[PDB]
């Protein structure tokens, strides 16, 4: 579904 944006380059996607 939806993911979170931790930092630049760090993104836990779906």
């Amino acid at each position: 579904k939806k993911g979170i944006a931790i930092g630049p380059g760090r993104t836990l996607y779906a």
Partner: antibody
Amino acid sequence: QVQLVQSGAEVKKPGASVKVSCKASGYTFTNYAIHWVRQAPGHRLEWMGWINGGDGNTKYSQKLQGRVTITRDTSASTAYMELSSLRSEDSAVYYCMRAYYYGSRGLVDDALDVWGQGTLVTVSS
Amino acid sequence: SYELTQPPSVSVSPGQTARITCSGDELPKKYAYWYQEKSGQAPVLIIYEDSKRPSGIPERFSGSSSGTMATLTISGAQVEDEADYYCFSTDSSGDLWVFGGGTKLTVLG
């Protein structure tokens, strides 16, 4: 316990550059990222960019790409924001905000809404 | 280049439920975040991750997201809720954040 303290207000001339600091305390500075948000006194919130406390990688707003440079000092636990070629449209209050999540799995500690007190810069001659 | 669209202003009566929307193309696969900024103060995070509510926020604040449209609901607002409300989310890659235009809530009477 978590706190973000910014530098004081400044004055600049059109064409100069301003640099605001943002000292962090109460958490691992390298585990979180720090945003930068500007807002004119009578306008809307604007996202500038953010930087990782550990990686140091930056992602700036496409409006401000080329003028803004966000840095950080791990030993001082302080992130910096520098904006060059200042014009009258830059007179605003500049905030620094810690990212919601930390680490590789995007967890949260005992807070997630951490904002600095704000720095009002005024470009004028 | 990514943008979040909010209504410019909404009006409500005391006790009524006010709905503030936020439309974005990446909202289907990106979370939404809401901020309340009163006149002369700093913004306050009232809703994070579409629906979750942080500690210390009144229970009358809630949010939902479906499709390319997020919504902020205030059940039984009072005069204290009269402020500006901004949207907040990321783009497709998730490296840059964008604020919404800002919705001004006005309580009547």
